[PDB]
């Protein structure tokens, strides 16, 4: 009961945080190169706790001289699932991805090449701090659904970096663009001749990858051919030290989906199954924030898949599934803590939890409030400190 109220509020606070923290794949026109640029952040869960951030900067330019579509600003939203083939002895990764464009509220000739299932081939040669490796992948893409299925093998033996750190490098032409956004699909517009995709990926507190790729049709097959160079890595760090989780935190208990629903109904105050800017603004104010209408619209747009300007119940479930797979940074947890720690002394008092829970539209007996404290209080001091809060929101 008390653990449900912590999880309910924790989810709401984390949700508000993620809506503001730029989690999608942001695409913009690059007129100077007749192509696009993109930026985004990837969260890599560290096996023993914590997150390794990877900040991506990207640019794509057409290989051919034919006309391409230069998009208005929008983003891609990715759902990735990593697994292992039980009958594969080589170092490998199996990948299932669903990628959808959004971010623009309510067709090129190259798009015609993507109406069915298209075979994919991927080849990567890498060198990270002098540790060389090669990867070959094969599978299929079904852009109608934004669906990719690939299997990758390290053809040089043992991969000297974690597989998750190579996912973004290892075919955005398979993204699903909604009907109202077909004019913003640069990737398909450049086909069949293709594009060059370049990135720098900064692993926070560690080294960086530099990648260059040619993506194009070779016959009926969409081929991704990549060179990757990594420098400045720590031999003992999260990447060369292989300290990152592999498997996607995939499975959802019905207790978890139920917690997401309880969180949803904190926002959805009129019980109509969708969250408006008014409702989101109401919750954020009750937590001590003061967003403008433009900010509220922008926050909703980050998860508003259908572009109708509200967060629908399925859109909320989808975002919460995405967010909870990946760990918060310590800066983010400290910020969540400060929603409760209203005076800043490093301790959440009963009066402070009482204030927050009151304002969020809950009538609670002080005994209910005290047993919340009791649940988080690892050292019977009658308060919640940061170390206790960190465990309560993980
Ligand atoms: Ca509503
Ligand atoms: Ca919506
Ligand atoms: Ca305090
Ligand atoms: Ca305590």
Q: What is the CATH number of the domain that holds 159?
A: 2.40.155.10
Residue 24 annotated as binding?
no
Q: Using DSSP, state whether 195 is helix, strand or coil.
A: strand
CB atoms within 10 A of CB 270: 10
Give helix then strand counts, H and E, for the chain. 10, 15
Residue 268 annotated as binding?
yes
Q: How far apart are CA 44 and CA 41, in angstroms?
A: 10
Residue 301 annotated as binding?
no
Find the ligand nearest to 106 CA: 2
CA of 346 to the centre of ligand 3 (A): 6
Q: How far apart are CA 23 and CA 14, in angstroms?
A: 13
Do 319 and 381 belong together in one domain? yes
Q: Using DSSP, state whether 3 is helix, strand or coil.
A: helix
Do 67 and 198 belong together in one domain? yes
Do 188 and 281 belong together in one domain? no
Residue 312 annotated as binding?
no
Structural domain range at position 210: 24-250
Q: Taking the alpha carbons of 33, 35, 41, 47 in that order, is the dihedral positive or negative? A: negative
Neighbours of ion ligand 3 (CB under 5 A): 341, 343, 345, 347
Do 14 and 33 belong together in one domain? no
- Residue 303: Cβ-neighbour burial (10 angstroms; 0-12, 13-18, 19+): buried
Residue 272 annotated as binding?
yes
CB atoms within 10 A of CB 353: 24
Residue 125 annotated as binding?
no
Find the ligand nearest to 380 CA: 4
When divided into structural domains, the chain yields a total of 2
CA of 253 to the centre of ligand 1 (A): 25
CA of 349 to the centre of ligand 4 (A): 9
Residue 72 annotated as binding?
no
Q: Taking the alpha carbons of 186, 189, 191, 196 in that order, is the dihedral positive or negative? A: negative
CA of 309 to the centre of ligand 3 (A): 37
**Technique that determined the structure:** X-ray
The alpha-helical segments, DSSP class H, found in 57-152 are none
Resolution in A: 2.0
What is the domain-level CATH number for residue 335?
1.10.238.10
Cis peptide before 310 (omega within 30 of 0): no
Q: How far apart are CA 334 and CA 346, in angstroms?
A: 10
Q: Quick one: how far is CA 70 from the chain centroid? A: 24
Do 198 and 263 belong together in one domain? no
Q: Taking the alpha carbons of 157, 159, 164, 167 in that order, is the dihedral positive or negative? A: negative
CA of 330 to the centre of ligand 4 (A): 19
Which tokens belong to 227?
């060179």
Find the ligand nearest to 349 CA: 3
Do 90 and 136 belong together in one domain? yes
Do 129 and 218 belong together in one domain? yes
CA of 260 to the centre of ligand 3 (A): 27
Contact between 221 and 120 under an 8 Å Cβ cutoff? The reply is yes
Neighbours of ion ligand 4 (CB under 5 A): 377, 379, 381, 383
* Listed residues 250, 281, 311: the one ending a domain: 250
Do 318 and 356 belong together in one domain? yes
Residue 220 annotated as binding?
no
Do 19 and 29 belong together in one domain? no
* Listed residues 250, 265, 287: the one ending a domain: 250
CA of 165 to the centre of ligand 1 (A): 39
**Residue at token pair 């597989």:** 163
Residue 347 annotated as binding?
yes
* Listed residues 250, 282, 303: the one ending a domain: 250
Do 325 and 233 belong together in one domain? no
Do 322 and 179 belong together in one domain? no
Residues of 358-371 as b/e, b for ≥16 C-beta within 10 angstroms? Answer: eebeeebeeeebbb
Question: Phi/psi at 198 (nearest 5 deg)?
Answer: -120, 140
Contact between 10 and 260 under an 8 Å Cβ cutoff? The reply is no
Do 205 and 279 belong together in one domain? no
Q: How far apart are CA 164 and CA 78, in angstroms?
A: 14
Residue 250 annotated as binding?
no
Q: How far apart are CA 245 and CA 250, in angstroms?
A: 12
Q: How far apart are CA 187 and CA 103, in angstroms?
A: 17
């Amino acid at each position: 009961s008390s653990r449900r109220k912590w999880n309910k509020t924790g989810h709401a606070v984390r949700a508000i945080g993620r809506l503001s923290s730029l989690e999608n794949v942001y695409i913009m026109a690059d007129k100077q190169k007749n192509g696009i640029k993109a930026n985004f952040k990837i969260r890599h869960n560290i096996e023993d706790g914590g997150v390794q951030l990877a900040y991506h900067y990207q640019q794509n330019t057409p290989i051919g001289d034919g006309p391409v579509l230069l998009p208005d600003n929008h983003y891609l939203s990715v759902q990735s699932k990593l697994s292992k083939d039980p009958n594969e002895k080589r170092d490998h990764m199996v990948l299932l991805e669903f990628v959808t464009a959004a971010g623009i509220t309510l067709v090129s000739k190259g798009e015609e090449l993507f109406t069915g299932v298209v075979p994919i081939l991927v080849e990567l040669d890498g060198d990270v701090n002098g540790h060389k490796f090669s990867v070959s992948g094969e599978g299929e893409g079904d852009a109608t659904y934004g669906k990719l299925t690939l299997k990758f093998i390290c053809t040089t033996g043992k991969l000297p970096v974690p597989w998750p750190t190579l996912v973004t490098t290892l075919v955005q032409c398979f993204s699903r663009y909604p009907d109202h956004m077909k004019q913003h699909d640069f990737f398909k517009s450049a086909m069949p001749e293709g594009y060059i995709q370049e990135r720098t990926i900064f692993f926070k507190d560690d080294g960086n990858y530099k990648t260059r790729a040619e993506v194009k049709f070779e016959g009926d097959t969409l081929v991704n051919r990549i060179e990757l160079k990594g420098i400045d890595f720590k031999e003992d760090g999260n990447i060369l030290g292989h300290k990152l989780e592999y498997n996607t935190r995939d499975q959802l208990t019905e207790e978890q989906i139920a917690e997401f629903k309880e969180a949803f109904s904190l926002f959805d105050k009129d019980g109509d199954g969708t969250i408006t800017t008014k409702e989101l603004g109401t919750v954020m104010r009750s937590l001590g924030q003061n967003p403008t209408e433009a900010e509220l619209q922008d926050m909703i747009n980050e998860v508003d898949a259908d572009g109708n300007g509200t967060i629908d119940f399925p859109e909320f479930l989808t975002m919460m599934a995405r967010w909870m797979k990946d760990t918060d940074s310590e800066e983010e947890i400290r910020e969540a803590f400060r929603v409760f720690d209203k005076d800043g002394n490093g301790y959440i008092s009963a009066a402070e939890l009482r204030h927050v829970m009151t304002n969020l539209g809950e009538k609670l007996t002080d005994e209910e409030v005290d047993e919340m404290i009791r649940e988080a209080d690892i050292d019977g001091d009658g308060q919640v400190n940061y170390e206790e809060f960190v465990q309560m929101m993980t």
